């Protein structure tokens, strides 16, 4: 990984020494960014809704995760599990459990620095998995991209800045989140966002995430070329406001 420091070197550590998952995958790929795609010329709006128990940017919540994926079923374009143990208290048997239960797009949300996560994310069932520029290096990052897509997973990207996004379309990253959220210091800049969104050509399925909580700012973001919207807090707080920023 990069040099880091703070508690993103404490888990890049955590995830460099996690366990395997040794079992077997029990479901298809469901292309994420295909899905996207099909959304939007069905226009449709496109929301992949979060399930985590802890996060650094908010308060745990203790709701099932069964009852919230089945309901996500039925208005998300995909789920995002969060399984880092640490700071967002997550787990595999959780995401594999989730996996188990719905047939939408699921991503597997961690701190990706070796391969065997990738073998993790495949066998547990995730349909893609999320590579975070700012903790890997070029060639780490151009690896485990290409080791992805051995699998059939398209990976998602995340960028942060305009050094995250150069990085990210010189490896040929073709499903980039955008997002407004600095890990580093969990501030939030959504005109850098913005900023970024606007230099990222068409050809590439763009998610914004970080912070939105307003079907306004998602259909000002559609009018940007933002393919996808991501939304965490919000959702696992009150599930059923997904109705309001699809319809």
């Known amino acids: 990984p990069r040099y880091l420091k ?17 079992a077997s995958r029990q479901r298809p790929i469901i292309s994420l960014n295909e899905r996207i795609l099909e959304f939007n010329k069905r226009n449709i709006t496109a929301i992949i809704a979060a399930y985590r128990r802890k996060s650094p940017s908010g308060l745990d919540v203790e709701r099932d995760p069964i009852e919230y994926s089945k309901f996500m079923e039925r208005y998300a374009v995909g789920l995002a599990v969060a399984t880092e143990e640490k700071y967002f208290n997550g787990s595999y048997e959780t995401l594999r459990k989730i996996a188990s239960s719905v047939s939408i ?9 070796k391969e065997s996560q990738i073998d993790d994310a495949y066998n547990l069932g995730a349909d893609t998995v999320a590579l975070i520029v700012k903790i890997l290096t070029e060639r780490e990052l ?17 960028i942060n800045d305009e050094n995250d996004l150069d990085i990210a379309l010189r490896i040929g990253a073709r499903f980039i989140e955008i997002c407004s959220r600095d890990l ?5 800049n959504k005109e850098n966002q913005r900023k970024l969104i606007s230099m990222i050509p068409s050809n590439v399925v763009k998610v914004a995430w970080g912070g939105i909580s307003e079907r306004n700012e998602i259909e000002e973001l559609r009018k940007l070329g933002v393919n996808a919207f991501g939304i965490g807090s919000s959702l696992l707080r009150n599930p059923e406001k997904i109705k309001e920023f699809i319809l």
């Open 142 to 158: 151009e690896s485990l991209l290409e080791y992805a897509r051995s699998y059939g997973m398209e990976p998602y990207i995340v």
């Open 6 to 22: 703070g508690w993103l070197k404490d888990v890049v550590q955590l995830s460099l020494r996690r366990p395997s998952f040794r």
């Open 105 to 113: 797009p699921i991503l597997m949300w961690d701190f990706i620095v």
């Open 184 to 188: 580093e210091t969990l501030e939030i």
